[PDB]
Structure formats: structure tokens, C-alpha cells
Amino acid sequence: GKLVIWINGDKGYNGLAEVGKKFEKDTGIKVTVEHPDKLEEKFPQVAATGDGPDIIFWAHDRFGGYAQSGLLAEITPDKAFQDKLYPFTWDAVRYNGKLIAYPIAVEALSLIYNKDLLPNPPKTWEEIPALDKELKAKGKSALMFNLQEPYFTWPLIAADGGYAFKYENGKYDIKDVGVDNAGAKAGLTFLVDLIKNKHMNADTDYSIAEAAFNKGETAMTINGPWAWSNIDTSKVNYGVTVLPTFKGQPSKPFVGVLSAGINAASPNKELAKEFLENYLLTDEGLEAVNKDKPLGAVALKSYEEELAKDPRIAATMENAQKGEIMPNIPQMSAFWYAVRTAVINAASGRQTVDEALKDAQT
Amino acid sequence: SDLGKKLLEAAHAGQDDEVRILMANGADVNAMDNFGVTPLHLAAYWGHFEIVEVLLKYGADVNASDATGDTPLHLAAKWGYLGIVEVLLKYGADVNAQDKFGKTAFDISIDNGNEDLAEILCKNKAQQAAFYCILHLPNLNEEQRNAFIQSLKDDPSQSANLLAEAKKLNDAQAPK
């Protein structure tokens, strides 16, 4: 007869506790929010014994796994409630044709640019060599971003025809792995051309790109909402916008959906449903959490319409709606490792873009 | 693993005198990186005319292609570098060479709106086509060759006229 909630320590868990106080005030039911470290490992471990939180918050990619182990109850929102959230977010939490979590927030890479260096940011990847030429003449660069992790280089590689797995029949298509095709090759070759012409350096990682942007050295960077804070401190006059297109098509960044699942072993499933749908997933509920620590863009249409008055959040959702939902699937790890090595090999000139891509698939 | 590296760097950076002393100390003028980018590539791409000149004077492979299929003529064409293009053409840059997309320096020049560039490239292709004709016209000894090649340098306006003669000559100098 109570609710225990787990959510990570970088979230607005105190705002979430306020929603819990309102819930108690209305129903008498006490709501306890905790933020154990490594809770994404703790939860499957203790849920396997019938323990843990009634409700767990985490990135959707992990929930496929939990569902597999029978740790996550099926959620039953009626179609009226489902219509209150953006439809593509319900796909991040669908597994074997059953909804297994409530989407809360939406996370994607955006183009971040220095408004001082670059008032009108490029709409295309194609313009960027030109811009770098201009900027290099006065001791700046156009663009620096993490070239080491596929997560960052994938939205370009995906844009002309790349894909991790296609979403046939609500589930994933595990048969066609889209790292060896013509659209991906074109993506990676444009990247490799940036590198060999000296517009970018292959050894640029996350720390190097962030420092470079946050010190005024580069006109643009590619990162996510988690990075906004450091830029805020740096006092660079930045804005955040739509990712540039390549061969006319949108850059497709992977989407992360912060989701709330109900413990399969919970005796408070209706309470938890009640809490999530009619307390948290409301304008006032997400607001409470968001004031404590910003959610970024949200799945709830009513509240996202408000937050989107911040252009950065708007860009985050526009890029999300243009990207691909992060596969909640196990063989994503094989994918990442393959993609990761294919990019390093190509960006290093170790392998041609051709050999590099067909190899990371065998 | 020594001078070639320093040279690619100095070429990229446009440090003229640094490039020239590396040369005078024996650097491979055609040193490549892991993309097969040569110093001549970087200087062409980055607009360093004097360096382009210096490298060519030292025997830089004017038609080198990197692993990606680009030639320095391709690279220079994208930025409308007239001088650079002119001097590569002087050292034998290949107006017919095609990049990854099947493009010539002329196609690129047309793509980027660079009319001045397209013109130079255009009349170079035409005068070379003329030169090449003369040189492979079978019924011409090495004398009559020079006679025509010279008269094509001294009047590139009457060129098409002149080719027509070289051919009717070739047809009268044949077993007809």
C-alpha cells in the first residue's frame, strides 16, 4: 500500500518527490523516491527476486531486456491517454506488441552553434567545408564534435540510407543490418573527406570538442541536452538548431526515451498506473520535475508545446522526430562495436570506406 | 617518420619558407599521409600559390590522386583558385581526370559557378585536344609535327582551321 520509485541521480528526483507528495495528499498513499547509483543494474537484480521499486525510470533501451526477464508489467493506457503523447515515443516502449513503460522524456543530438561566429548556421553538411575555409582564415574552425563514438557520427552515416534495424511489424527486423549499403557509404565518405581535407581531425573526442566549442575556438559542435549546462557557464552566446542535411535527407540521430516502468512483482500496479498517468504525465507533474532538473523535450504533447518555446528544446524534438529510436534490442552491442571500428578504420585511412563497412558486419 | 610529415604540415599551413628549406634538405616532395594526400594536394586545397609553384618546380606529381580519387586540380577548382589552376595546368594537370563522383575540374568549376575558372579549364582542354591530334596523326614525321604544334601556339584562334589542314595533309600523305 505504498509506492517506491527509482530514478537516476541526474534527474529531478526532488521535483518527482513533490508529485509524490500531491499523490499522498489526495490518496493517503505514501510515495518514496530513491536514486540508487547503478540502479539500472540494481533493478533487474532485485526484481528477479520479487523486490525493488514499484516504478523504475530509465532510458528505454534497457527495458527490452527487463521485459525479456519478465521484470516489467504490461501497461494499459487506453487510446485516449496514448493520444496525449507523441506517437513515435510509444514505439520506444513497445516490446513484443505489449507496451511495457510510459514515455517521459525525449533525448537527441542537435547542432550547437556559436551565434557570434556564425549567425546563420548551415542547413547542409555540404556547406561546411566552405565555412571552415572562411573560419580557418581567422584562426577558427567550423565544426568539432566527437568522432570516436558512432553515437555521434551515426546521424550523418544514417542520413542517405543508413539504419540499425528497420521497424517492420512493430518489432525490429534483425535480418538486414544497415551498415553495409550505398547510403551509409556516402555518409562515411563525406565524413572521411572532411577529415582528409583537414576540416576535422580524426582524434577529436568528446572532451576535445566540448572544450573547443566552450572556449570560442569552433563555430559549431554536435551534442545533446546534457551538455547545455557547461556551455551556459562558459557564457558562449550559443543557440541550438536542427541537424544539417546530407544529400537532401535529414541527419538521423538516435533517440533516447526516458521511460517509467512498473515492477512485474508490484502489488500496487493500479496505484502506479494512477500515479504515472494522472499525476506525473500532466503539465503540473512534468513541471515539478522539470523545475528541479530540466527534462529536455518531453513525450507529453500539452507540456512539450510549452517547453518548445525554448528554441533549444524545440530543436531537440525536431531532431528526435527526424531520427531513429534507439533499438531496445540485445544485438545493439554487436552493432555499436562493429560501427565503432568501421569508423575508426575509415577515419584513420587504415581502410577504405568500402572495405571498412562491409567488414564490420561479418 | 621525418621530413615528409613536416612538409605536409608546412604545405597545409602555408609556411612558404619552411616548405622550401624542407625541400632543400631532401624531403620527399610527394610524401603522402594515410589518405595518400600529398603536399601538392594540401597547398592546392588551401590556396597556397607560391608553395604549389615550389612543389611543382621540385617535381611534385602534378596528377597525383589521393586514396579518395582527388587530384590537386580537383581541389583547386572547388575554391576558384585561378593562379593555382593555371600553374598546375602549366605543369601538366589532367583536365580529364575524374573524381569519386565522376567529375572533372571543369564539372566542379561549373558546379560552383566559377566562370573564370571554367574558361581557363575549357580552353586548355581544347588546345590540348588540338596538340594531341597533331602528335598522333600517323602520316607526319617529327618535322611536320613541330611545324604544326608551333603554329598552334602562335595562333590558337586559327586552330580548328589548322587541324583541318593537318588532317587533309594526313589524308594526302596516305596510301589513297
Numbering used by the authors:
A (entry chain B): 5 to 366
B (entry chain A): 12 to 135, 1218 to 1269
Task: Give verbatim lines from the article.
Here we propose a novel method for connecting the pre-existing α-helices of two proteins into a single extended helix using a chemical cross linker. EY-CBS (3,3′-ethyne-1,2-diylbis-{6-[(chloroacetyl)amino]benzenesulfonic acid}) is a chemical cross linker that can react simultaneously with two cysteines in the i and i+11 positions of the α-helix19. To test whether EY-CBS detects the formation of a helix, we chose two amino acid residues separated by 11 amino acids in the proposed fusion helix and mutated them to cysteines. In conclusion, we have developed a new method that can convert two pre-existing α-helices into one long extended helix.
We chose an artificial ankyrin protein, named ‘mbp3-16', that has been engineered to bind maltose-binding protein (MBP), and the B4 domain of protein A as a model system to test our fusion helix method. To verify fusion of the helices, we crystallized the 3,311 fusion protein before and after reaction with EY-CBS and determined the structures of the two products. Since the ankyrin domain, mbp3–16, had been engineered to bind MBP, we were able to use MBP to facilitate crystallization. In the crystal structure, one MBP molecule interacted exclusively with the mbp3–16 component of the hybrid protein and there was no interaction with either protein A or the fusion helix. The electron density map calculated using the refined protein structure showed a clear density corresponding to the EY-CBS, and one EY-CBS molecule could be modelled into the density. Both reactive ends of the EY-CBS are covalently linked to the cysteines in the fusion helix. In the crystal structure, the fusion helix adopts a nearly ideal α-helical structure and matches closely to the intended structure. The Cα atoms of the cysteines are separated by 16.8 angstrom and the mutated alanines are located under the phenyl rings of EY-CBS, as designed. The structures of the ankyrin and protein A domains are easily superimposable on those of the isolated proteins, which demonstrates that the helix fusion has no impact on the structure of the protein other than near the fusion site. The sulfate moieties of the EY-CBS groups form nonspecific ionic interactions with three lysine groups of the protein A and ankyrin domains.
